[PDB]
Design a protein around this ligand. Sequence first.
Ligand code: 7J5
Lengths: 245, 297, 99, 49, 242, 242, 49, 48, 58, 58
Amino acid sequence: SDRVAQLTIGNSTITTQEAANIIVGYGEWPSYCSDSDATAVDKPTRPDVSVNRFYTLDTKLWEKSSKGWYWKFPDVLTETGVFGQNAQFHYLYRSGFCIHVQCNASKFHQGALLVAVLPEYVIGTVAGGTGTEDTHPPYKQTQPGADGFELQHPYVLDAGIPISQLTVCPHQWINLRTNNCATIIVPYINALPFDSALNHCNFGLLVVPISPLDYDQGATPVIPITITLAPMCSEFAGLRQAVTQ
Amino acid sequence: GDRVADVIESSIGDSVSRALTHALPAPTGQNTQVSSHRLDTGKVPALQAAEIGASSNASDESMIETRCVLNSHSTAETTLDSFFSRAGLVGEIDLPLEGTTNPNGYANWDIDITGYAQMRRKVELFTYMRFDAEFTFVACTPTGEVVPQLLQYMFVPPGAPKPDSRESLAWQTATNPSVFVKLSDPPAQVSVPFMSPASAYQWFYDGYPTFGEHKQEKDLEYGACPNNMMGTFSVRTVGTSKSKYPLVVRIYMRMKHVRAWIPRPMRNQNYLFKANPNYAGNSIKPTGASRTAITTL
Amino acid sequence: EIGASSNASDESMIETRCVLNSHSTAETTLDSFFSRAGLVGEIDLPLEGTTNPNGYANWDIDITGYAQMRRKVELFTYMRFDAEFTFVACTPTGEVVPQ
Amino acid sequence: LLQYMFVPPGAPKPDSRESLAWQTATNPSVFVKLSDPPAQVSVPFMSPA
Amino acid sequence: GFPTELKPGTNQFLTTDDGVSAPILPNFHPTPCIHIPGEVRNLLELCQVETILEVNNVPTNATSLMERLRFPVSAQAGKGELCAVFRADPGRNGPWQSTLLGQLCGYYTQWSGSLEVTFMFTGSFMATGKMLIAYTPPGGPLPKDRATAMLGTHVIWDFGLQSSVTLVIPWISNTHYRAHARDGVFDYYTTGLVSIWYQTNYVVPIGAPNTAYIIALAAAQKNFTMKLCKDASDILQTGTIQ
Amino acid sequence: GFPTELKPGTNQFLTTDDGVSAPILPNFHPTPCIHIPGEVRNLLELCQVETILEVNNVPTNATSLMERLRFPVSAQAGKGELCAVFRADPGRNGPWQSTLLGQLCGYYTQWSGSLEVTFMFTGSFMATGKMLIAYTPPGGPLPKDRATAMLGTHVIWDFGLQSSVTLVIPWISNTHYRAHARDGVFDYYTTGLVSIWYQTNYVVPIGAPNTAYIIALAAAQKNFTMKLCKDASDILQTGTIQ
Amino acid sequence: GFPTELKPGTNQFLTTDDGVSAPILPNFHPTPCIHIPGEVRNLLELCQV
Amino acid sequence: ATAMLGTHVIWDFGLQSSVTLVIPWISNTHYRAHARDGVFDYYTTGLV
Amino acid sequence: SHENSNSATEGSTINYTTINYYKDSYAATAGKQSLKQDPDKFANPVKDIFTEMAAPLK
Amino acid sequence: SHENSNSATEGSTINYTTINYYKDSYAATAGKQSLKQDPDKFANPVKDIFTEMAAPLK
Ligand SMILES: CCO/N=C/c1ccc(OCC[C@@H](C)CCN2CCN(c3ccnc(C(N)=O)c3)C2=O)cc1
């Protein structure tokens, strides 16, 4: 009655019989931009069902040695379905997100994944190792797309900050002996009412194993982690030709 | 007009962001109520499910037998203004006589407070901040001596001409705000408003400032947010002839009327550069101290 | 040709939304624009020179010797105003002497 | 010009004239000249007792 | 005396400080103010007056400066050819510098508002034509063809008794205010591009010039405001003014 | 003029002085503030959010740092063996340094309040067990055995559907506030010790791992407050930041 | 500014002067005062013992 | 990734042994005749 | 305050809110000006005003 | 005082008690802030809140 759940939006429905409730980032549901917060004057377009639906974008394999991965929003969807097209044809974009991370195993497997959302997740480099070289991360690392990217130094989140304090952000855990999914609802987070879906990534989704995956020889060794997400209250403005970046 | 049902009953356009939580006044630490032994089935405060993502709701009252304690300890000193409204160093400007830096009697400093660790680490606890600020300017020679010298500080906002010499025409300062003061006078001090084009300044921007191909040679612009670039602070000795004294200007900032959003993990690796969170990859250190065994102090 | 500016507005050229604009117009008042002290005169009193080596000087009150201030006031033909004048003195190196 | 700084228990004590602790971002500091009148401030009752 | 204590700031001269200063002429009374036409109250009043936009800012020799005030149109081959282009950025180097709006804009760090450019056709009464004027919001590169420009905000202009048409450059920004845009990171604040294409063609009968000119007038809409006073980028003086 | 008299303090610059200073931009109006989620009002709001406590703060090589975030439990021999121990002192060098509470705690000289540590068992569903978690108030040396630990404040944890259990470290102090404790006379302010023992044993059937991990999350109770602002013990910078 | 005129005494530090001085710890709140026996209010109380 | 763009259900094995996929009536015509290879594929319902 | 009315703006169509310590009003601060505007005086000084919808020349 | 409303906190969910001598509010002191707190926004942002006595997962 808190373990079972159904998430229906658009022409897609998700089910889970081993949930752990739902998290609503910073305690507030997504919403459309009010006429007093807005600034751009053109009438926005709100596609609704064609873009506010669940998209399953990627599957990673959880291994005994995995370090963790991250994805950037809205980067992950800029080239998928109708949402992508609208993000490409419009200068302005804004929306919320419902993130559903899936990972099931057996009552004999163990391990725990920390699933968290970190706004304005700026990536840092190791500065040439000695820290005397001012290097910068490449586009494929700041905006990895749907395939995401693997963390090199999870302890410091590849940005000189302690992952041990990541729980100060909207998060959930996937502890195999307890639940097989994590659901986080995120409102639009920015210092502006609208912004570019291409140049700016509002937040990053981190999925990091804190307690290593383990099991005995003979049990299914392939344990996938699938990422499904849905935009909420998508709004677009500033129409012109399509642009990919 | 609207006639088909799905349109009439849609929530498309709801601008009211529903909030699950609300603030309550809390001027003092919560009190402790009396409690006694409880030997029940069904009731189990001690057991939690951290997976949910929420913190434990268990309290002293339900874990041990407590007494009543009227707690009048204030919560005042942990407000944002209490924490930040304390002047700290955010900039140094040298005006040497014989040097390799600013030997021409003037200097331009890009307003950027991320050059000093103490102040930087405090503001980076939050992602977005909006505030006014009080700026204090302390001048003296490199020995701390006070000399009879007149200086001119001028705030050059983006787009205004940056002085290129001690006699530059821009010092006419007909529109930009300038302060003329003596090293003998007390430190100059002024109030600065919230000047960003955005609703708040942001210590982190996971994006690029422009469109196009973001090739290797432009990656230095990743994370650069013009909304945070308030301009230049220019200083000069007032005269057509070189100063007789070497000078140093220390800049202190005191935030006030502060609002902050989105807390984040606190820096645990030394800082290296102003513009980014780069860290020395070969010196990744634990967040804190360590010990020999988990079973020994 | 009439000599008037276009009366066309956003509302009638594209489909617009409602925007409650609370951006102030305060900083563009005449006082906001002009009530900022600027340089309008320099007077030299050198010891050995060709100009005012006698320890005194007469300056004809005329603020048109400096471009920044001049260009701003010349945007208008007629102006009426009071003024605050500030006098900054020092040696040519910017030194302060007991004089 | 001098700098007085109050370093409460647990705050880093400056170990030199150029110590980083002089950034005084949180501790209270007073900058004053020997030429100025004596510096003067009010201190509250700070004991845990 | 009354116990006081000097605080930092003491003795400083802040050029924008709005204080009180002793009056030099006690009991002085100014000449009464008679009525004078054209009093202005706010610089925004002037930003709404259209001035000539130098779209054709290419000729530089003294004898050809006047040609900057107008650009040409003429009979084409019906391939939806391009007529002209320019950035909409008002406080940026380029065409807008010829306008009073662009100049006043230079005394402020940030601006916000919709813009409008009115094009007046000065060809002969017998000349007809249809042009497509488009506004491409940020992120859209200069349109390669008319079909691409047409995807943005645009107006289709038909020559006739009404000599002019107005293109509105609606305020479409991410931030509430834009700082002056320039090459580099500050291109973040660019307004976009304006392109003019032939919708049909410039047509004329026997006896009338095959080339005519268009004059562009620009100004700001009533939702336009500016903030954070600053000195203009120019200082019109080389040496001392004698 | 009005008779005044300067008093001591005159001309000094006190960094925590809350005064008035002349505004540099007269009549300036800031960009309106739109709604932004997650506004914080008091640092105490953050002290109540649990973060990972590095009980296992022993590995130091880069490749093994993540192991500090969790400690192990495994099948024993039923002699009520010891699992782990750590000081409860929140503002002291050790495990608490990994937590946001410990870090924020570093900006205040004194604190007061109850603490709570929640332990989450990440073993497999088939693993069972019962642990004794104890809190020994000041004066009690590290318990030599379980029988000694059991004499203090403790919780007996039973693994089951509820993956976690919360140990409350109730505020038991002589003084109303404690300063940060460290070796020496300031140990006067120590909070005490926390020890974890096997109440029964970690049991598992054929087919499931014989070793599993526990993750510890710590935060403060609602009676927790802090006073007397001070700079943190660390300054994250070696040379000048360029 | 407001017309003032410094009078003799200016800048002096009188040890028995009862004045106001800037507080170093804004918004600081002292540890509450519990009851303690034997509070004295006036030295004359002791002269009678 | 391509299938996911249409109407779908994500099924999680558990105590409830079954899950229901609804094939909602999405047609151009009010009625469909029986579909078969050829022009009558006009009436096809789709794929699962 | 009972001072002299010797300010440059005495009798203006816009009232000000100022501070002063002297008997001569011009010694006062700049204060705040009234936010009134009249763009038409410059942008639309036509005798017979024409609507937006209609054609200016008919 | 009749000044401008140009403070960073103008229109905040917490009222302040400040001092100022200038026409621009941001020149004012920091003052005292309102002692309101909302820990749940971060510590307990769950959709369906669960009691202390009951078992979080049922
Ligand atoms: C006589 C004239 O006297 N004039 C004085 C005067 C003094 C100070 C003034 O301006 C104060 C603006 C300050 C508060 C903004 C500091 N901020 C906000 C965001 N940000 C930032 C964010 C992310 N990254 C970086 C980065 N550098 O990588 C940097 C900042 O540094 C203006 C004028």
